[PDB]
Structures are given as structure tokens and as C-alpha cells.
Write an enzyme that holds these catalytic residues in place. Structure first.
Site, PDB file in Angstrom:
ATOM      1  N   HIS A  52      24.401  69.453  33.863  1.00 17.94           N
ATOM      2  CA  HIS A  52      24.427  70.485  34.835  1.00 17.94           C
ATOM      3  C   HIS A  52      24.319  71.694  34.270  1.00 17.94           C
ATOM      4  O   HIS A  52      25.188  71.844  33.301  1.00 17.94           O
ATOM      5  CB  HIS A  52      25.573  70.154  35.786  1.00 17.94           C
ATOM      6  CG  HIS A  52      25.721  69.019  36.750  1.00 17.94           C
ATOM      7  ND1 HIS A  52      26.180  67.969  36.021  1.00 17.94           N
ATOM      8  CD2 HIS A  52      25.082  68.647  37.876  1.00 17.94           C
ATOM      9  CE1 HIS A  52      26.197  66.852  37.132  1.00 17.94           C
ATOM     10  NE2 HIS A  52      25.423  67.460  37.925  1.00 17.94           N
ATOM     11  N   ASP A  55      28.014  72.568  33.554  1.00 23.37           N
ATOM     12  CA  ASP A  55      28.635  71.835  32.521  1.00 23.37           C
ATOM     13  C   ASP A  55      28.758  72.554  31.220  1.00 23.37           C
ATOM     14  O   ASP A  55      29.565  72.465  30.124  1.00 23.37           O
ATOM     15  CB  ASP A  55      28.057  70.470  32.152  1.00 23.37           C
ATOM     16  CG  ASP A  55      28.186  69.677  33.462  1.00 23.37           C
ATOM     17  OD1 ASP A  55      29.160  69.652  34.110  1.00 23.37           O
ATOM     18  OD2 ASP A  55      27.475  68.586  33.512  1.00 23.37           O
ATOM     19  N   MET A  86      16.794  65.459  30.320  1.00 23.27           N
ATOM     20  CA  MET A  86      17.174  65.923  31.673  1.00 23.27           C
ATOM     21  C   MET A  86      18.052  66.856  31.844  1.00 23.27           C
ATOM     22  O   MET A  86      19.024  66.889  30.934  1.00 23.27           O
ATOM     23  CB  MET A  86      17.339  64.517  32.402  1.00 23.27           C
ATOM     24  CG  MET A  86      17.858  64.732  33.819  1.00 23.27           C
ATOM     25  SD  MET A  86      19.245  65.176  34.391  1.00 23.27           S
ATOM     26  CE  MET A  86      20.103  63.516  34.549  1.00 23.27           C
ATOM     27  N   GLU A 179      17.715  62.478  43.562  1.00 25.73           N
ATOM     28  CA  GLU A 179      18.742  61.464  43.473  1.00 25.73           C
ATOM     29  C   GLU A 179      19.565  61.136  44.818  1.00 25.73           C
ATOM     30  O   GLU A 179      20.037  62.103  45.438  1.00 25.73           O
ATOM     31  CB  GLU A 179      19.811  61.725  42.497  1.00 25.73           C
ATOM     32  CG  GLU A 179      20.793  60.520  42.197  1.00 25.73           C
ATOM     33  CD  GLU A 179      21.951  60.945  41.163  1.00 25.73           C
ATOM     34  OE1 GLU A 179      21.821  62.056  40.553  1.00 25.73           O
ATOM     35  OE2 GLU A 179      22.928  60.177  41.194  1.00 25.73           O
ATOM     36  N   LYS A 181      21.948  59.400  47.568  1.00 29.69           N
ATOM     37  CA  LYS A 181      23.417  59.031  47.845  1.00 29.69           C
ATOM     38  C   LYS A 181      23.612  58.684  49.023  1.00 29.69           C
ATOM     39  O   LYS A 181      23.113  59.854  49.964  1.00 29.69           O
ATOM     40  CB  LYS A 181      24.363  59.913  46.994  1.00 29.69           C
ATOM     41  CG  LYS A 181      25.668  59.096  47.107  1.00 29.69           C
ATOM     42  CD  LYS A 181      26.641  60.003  46.399  1.00 29.69           C
ATOM     43  CE  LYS A 181      27.921  59.192  46.060  1.00 29.69           C
ATOM     44  NZ  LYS A 181      29.137  60.221  45.526  1.00 29.69           N
ATOM     45  N   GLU A 215      20.495  55.742  41.699  1.00 29.19           N
ATOM     46  CA  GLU A 215      21.697  55.431  40.875  1.00 29.19           C
ATOM     47  C   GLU A 215      22.142  53.996  41.269  1.00 29.19           C
ATOM     48  O   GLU A 215      22.311  53.864  42.457  1.00 29.19           O
ATOM     49  CB  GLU A 215      22.740  56.600  41.014  1.00 29.19           C
ATOM     50  CG  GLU A 215      24.008  56.046  40.447  1.00 29.19           C
ATOM     51  CD  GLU A 215      25.066  57.029  40.471  1.00 29.19           C
ATOM     52  OE1 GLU A 215      24.873  58.039  39.990  1.00 29.19           O
ATOM     53  OE2 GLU A 215      26.365  56.694  40.999  1.00 29.19           O
ATOM     54  N   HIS A 218      24.941  53.917  43.896  1.00 31.56           N
ATOM     55  CA  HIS A 218      24.767  54.673  45.362  1.00 31.56           C
ATOM     56  C   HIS A 218      23.942  53.828  46.113  1.00 31.56           C
ATOM     57  O   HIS A 218      24.442  53.812  47.420  1.00 31.56           O
ATOM     58  CB  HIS A 218      23.895  55.902  45.097  1.00 31.56           C
ATOM     59  CG  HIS A 218      24.601  56.937  44.272  1.00 31.56           C
ATOM     60  ND1 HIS A 218      24.217  58.063  43.867  1.00 31.56           N
ATOM     61  CD2 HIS A 218      25.839  56.902  43.892  1.00 31.56           C
ATOM     62  CE1 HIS A 218      25.004  59.052  43.266  1.00 31.56           C
ATOM     63  NE2 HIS A 218      26.274  58.235  43.348  1.00 31.56           N
ATOM     64  N   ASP A 243      19.834  56.084  36.746  1.00 32.61           N
ATOM     65  CA  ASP A 243      21.161  56.437  36.537  1.00 32.61           C
ATOM     66  C   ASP A 243      22.031  55.067  36.645  1.00 32.61           C
ATOM     67  O   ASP A 243      21.656  54.400  37.570  1.00 32.61           O
ATOM     68  CB  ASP A 243      22.013  57.380  37.453  1.00 32.61           C
ATOM     69  CG  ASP A 243      21.980  58.708  37.247  1.00 32.61           C
ATOM     70  OD1 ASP A 243      21.200  59.241  36.374  1.00 32.61           O
ATOM     71  OD2 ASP A 243      22.523  59.546  38.126  1.00 32.61           O
ATOM     72  N   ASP A 253      32.308  56.086  45.587  1.00 30.20           N
ATOM     73  CA  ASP A 253      31.655  55.939  44.380  1.00 30.20           C
ATOM     74  C   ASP A 253      32.360  55.941  43.179  1.00 30.20           C
ATOM     75  O   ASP A 253      33.020  56.956  42.883  1.00 30.20           O
ATOM     76  CB  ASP A 253      30.654  57.451  44.537  1.00 30.20           C
ATOM     77  CG  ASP A 253      29.761  57.419  43.158  1.00 30.20           C
ATOM     78  OD1 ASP A 253      28.945  56.668  43.162  1.00 30.20           O
ATOM     79  OD2 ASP A 253      29.317  58.592  42.971  1.00 30.20           O
ATOM     80  N   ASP A 285      25.483  57.632  34.248  1.00 30.96           N
ATOM     81  CA  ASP A 285      26.194  58.457  34.944  1.00 30.96           C
ATOM     82  C   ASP A 285      27.516  57.639  35.650  1.00 30.96           C
ATOM     83  O   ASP A 285      27.429  56.641  36.588  1.00 30.96           O
ATOM     84  CB  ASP A 285      25.550  58.700  36.229  1.00 30.96           C
ATOM     85  CG  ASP A 285      26.210  59.880  37.105  1.00 30.96           C
ATOM     86  OD1 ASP A 285      27.382  60.375  36.732  1.00 30.96           O
ATOM     87  OD2 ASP A 285      25.760  60.157  38.228  1.00 30.96           O
TER      88      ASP A 285
END
Ligand SMILES: [Mg+2]
Ligand SMILES: [Mg+2]
Ligand code: NA
Length: 385
Positions: A52, A55, A86, A179, A181, A215, A218, A243, A253, A285
Site C-alpha cells: 500500500h 506502507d 502489484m 478484492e 470481503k 482472498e 474472505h 491472495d 478475518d 496476504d
């Protein structure tokens, strides 16, 4: 079961870098410098890392500080041969995003979210990323009146359409992956499963630019079959990224290391990815549990890759076994792959063997032989052949 960069294993900076703060507890580990993470992951046999914006560049950094953070990171990539396939945007941590980014009720927040995303798309392209992920973790609601979902979907479409216009206008070779969730941190999140995300993409102005980043954990938070969902994404041509992690059922999660959680689902997932020829990154992840020190962080990361490689071996042995190939024919997997009515509608209507003269009782009496097939799969997974 030693990984090499050719295996395309990748990790987010936020995975091994997770400090262990959970809703009920403070951090148990110090922050990791991204440069150290790149070096340690390279030594374990990883292919690359993902990030990200926040990050890599601390939120609020000046332009000069931003330049220095990127320069240091690029040197670590050059020193190790690590790639960045990515990148993504943090539209969830800062309090300004408490009601969402792209679907916040406040219009000024939605505009800011788009500008923050666009700035990081430029950086992602500079670093060589081929996929740009969007996890809309704050897009949703705790209560029914707070969010008109039709209006929110209009705003979500507007945002993704603008991002597609931006990348097309700049001539970038990047694609987007949504993505899903179902919940957490919002009570319900918009586009909660692979299916909802795939359906939404078909209403975008340039659907070819968008796919999914499912993911493991998820989909399992909704009790769904993750391999089945991946098969639908592959069938639609939309599996742009994935993921990998583990999850023990319907709960918060967990982001366990890959192979933990539902082990048989992990086997069937690897079987599917390898059979289908998925060529994208095998991205983890995951969160090393907060019980662990740094030695445990690296052990958990190594375990992600090890478990993929073991399962790959077992799934390949399963598919190559002549006894399994016979069992697949006994269960009529070959017939499933043949068209129902390549002869066409009129021929089907005129075919008395399909209705008037069909022996339903004889067909009903045929066993499917699925339990024998599944026990061969179990034996192969456990190395008991
Ligand atoms: Mg997760
Ligand atoms: Mg994820
Ligand atoms: Na579009």
C-alpha cells in the site's frame, strides 16, 4: 520443497511487517523497515513484494521525504532482484476514511480518495507493477439507513470508471483487481464476494480493465467454497491476482499462513490453479500471529511457500495417477466436459431417447462413485498411496 523466484511467491510489506495490534491489544513487535523486509524475503526465496502507498511512504510525508523513501526501496529491489508485481492504496486506516473512500457519504472525501489513489498508480507503474488492487474495506455500513446502496454503487462505478479513464489517458499497462470481503471492519462491506465483484465489473465502462483479487479467507468468512469461486473467476477470464492465506471458518478475518485453516480446500485450490495454468503471482496476504517474535515471522512466511509446494506435488501426483484417471471416468467427469446438445435445440426436441423413451429408473440407479474418488484424493494428499 525449497522455493525459488521462478515460483512467483510474493508478500505484502504489511504481512511480515504486521506489528500485532488487534482490536484488544497493543503491538507485540517493532516496526520493520521495508528495506529489511525485502532483503529477508529475498533470502527465503520470494519473487517479489507488494505495498500500500502508506506502507512505503509514511502518511503526510513531504515530496522530498517521499523521494528518499522510494530511492531506498528501489535500491533494495536492485540489490536483491525482487520485483513489485502489484500495488494498492490504503483507503481504510486514516480516520478520514471512517465511512469509506470511494463511497463515503461526504463528497469531498470521495474526491480525496480518488486523488490519493491516482498518485499511487503513478508510483506503481514506475516500480513495474502489472496489477493495481482495490480492497474497499470501509465501503459499507453498520446500519440500514446510513447507506443507500444503489447510490453507493453509482459512486463506486464512477470512481472505477474515472480510474480507467486515467490509466487509458496516460497509456499505462496496468489492470485493476477488486478484492471482495463480506464484513470487517464494516458491519457489511459492499461487493461482499467474488460473485458480486464479477457482476459489478460488467457494468463498468471498460470492463476489460478490471478483474478480481479473491482472498481465501474472505470467501470462507461467508462459508463459501473458495475453489468454486476461483473456478467461476477463471471461467469469466477475470482472475488477475490472488491472495493466499488460511481461515478457520466463519469468524473474524484471521489471515493465517497458507495451508492453515481448511487444508483440503487449499489442496483443491492448488490443483485448480496449476491445472488451469494460472500464471500470476502467488501472493500471500497473511499475518504472523502476535504470539511470535521475528524468528516466528520468518518461519510463518517460509511455511506459506512450503505448503504451496507440498500441495502442488500432491495435486500433480493425484492427476497423474492412472487409478485416479480411471476413477474420474467411472464418475463421468469426461461426460461433464462434453456438450449436452451440440446437435441443437430441434434435434433435442425430436430425440425420443431424451424424454419419451428415457429410462429414468436405470439412470437413477447408477452410482456416481464419488466417495472412492474422494478417498483417492485423500490418500494422495496425505501421501498414503
Ligand atoms: Mg484477510
Ligand atoms: Mg487481501
Ligand atoms: Na471503466
Amino acid at each position: 520443497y525449497q522455493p525459488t523466484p521462478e515460483d512467483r511467491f510474493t508478500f505484502g510489506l504489511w504481512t511480515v511487517g504486521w506489528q500485532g495490534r488487534d482490536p484488544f491489544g497493543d503491538a507485540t513487535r517493532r516496526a520493520l523497515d521495508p528495506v529489511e523486509s525485502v532483503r529477508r524475503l529475498a533470502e527465503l526465496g520470494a519473487h517479489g513484494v507488494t505495498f500500500h502507498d502508506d506502507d512505503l511512504i509514511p502518511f503526510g510525508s513531504s515530496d522530498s521525504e517521499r523521494e528518499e523513501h522510494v530511492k531506498r526501496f528501489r535500491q533494495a529491489l536492485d540489490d536483491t532482484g525482487m520485483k513489485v508485481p502489484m500495488a494498492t492504496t490504503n483507503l481504510f486506516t486514516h480516520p478520514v476514511f471512517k465511512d469509506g473512500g470511494f463511497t463515503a457519504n461526504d463528497r469531498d472525501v470521495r474526491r480525496y480518495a480518488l486523488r490519493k489513489t491516482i498518485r499511487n498508480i503513478d508510483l506503481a507503474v514506475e516500480l513495474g507493477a502489472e496489477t493495481y488492487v482495490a480492497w474497499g474495506g470501509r465501503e459499507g455500513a453498520e446500519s440500514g439507513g446510513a447507506k443507500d446502496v444503489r447510490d453507493a454503487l453509482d459512486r463506486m462505478k464512477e470512481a472505477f470508471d474515472l480510474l480507467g479513464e486515467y490509466v487509458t489517458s496516460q497509456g499505462y499497462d496496468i489492470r485493476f483487481a477488486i478484492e471482495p470481503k463480506p464484513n470487517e471492519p464494516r458491519g457489511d462491506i459492499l461487493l461482499p464476494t467474488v460473485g458480486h465483484a464479477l457482476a459489478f465489473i460488467e457494468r463498468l465502462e471498460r470492463p476489460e480493465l478490471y478483474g478480481v483479487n479473491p482472498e481465501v479467507g474472505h470467501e470462507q468468512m461467508a462459508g463459501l467454497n473458495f475453489p468454486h469461486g476461483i473456478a467461476q473467476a477463471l471461467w469469466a477470464g477475470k482472475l488477475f491476482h490472488i491472495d493466499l492465506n488460511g481461515q478457520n471458518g466463519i469468524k473474524y478475518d484471521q489471515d493465517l499462513r497458507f495451508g492453515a485453516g481448511d487444508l483440503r480446500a487449499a489442496f483443491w485450490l492448488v490443483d485448480l490453479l496449476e491445472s488451469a495454468g494460472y500464471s500470476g503471482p502467488r501472493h500471500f496476504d497473511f499475518k504472523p500471529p502476535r504470539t511470535e517474535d521475528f524468528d516466528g515471522v520468518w518461519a510463518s512466511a517460509a511455511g506459506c511457500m512450503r505448503n504451496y509446494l507440498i500441495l502442488k506435488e500432491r495435486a500433480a501426483a493425484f492427476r497423474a495417477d492412472p487409478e485416479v484417471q480411471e476413477a474420474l471416468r467411472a464418475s463421468r467427469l469426461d461426460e461433464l466436459a462434453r456438450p449436452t446438445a451440440a446437435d441443437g435445440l430441434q434435434a433435442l426436441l425430436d430425440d425420443r431417447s431424451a424424454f419419451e423413451e428415457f429410462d429414468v429408473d436405470a439412470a437413477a440407479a447408477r452410482g456416481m462413485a464419488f466417495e472412492r474418488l474422494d478417498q483417492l484424493a485423500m490418500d494422495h494428499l496425505l501421501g498414503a498411496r
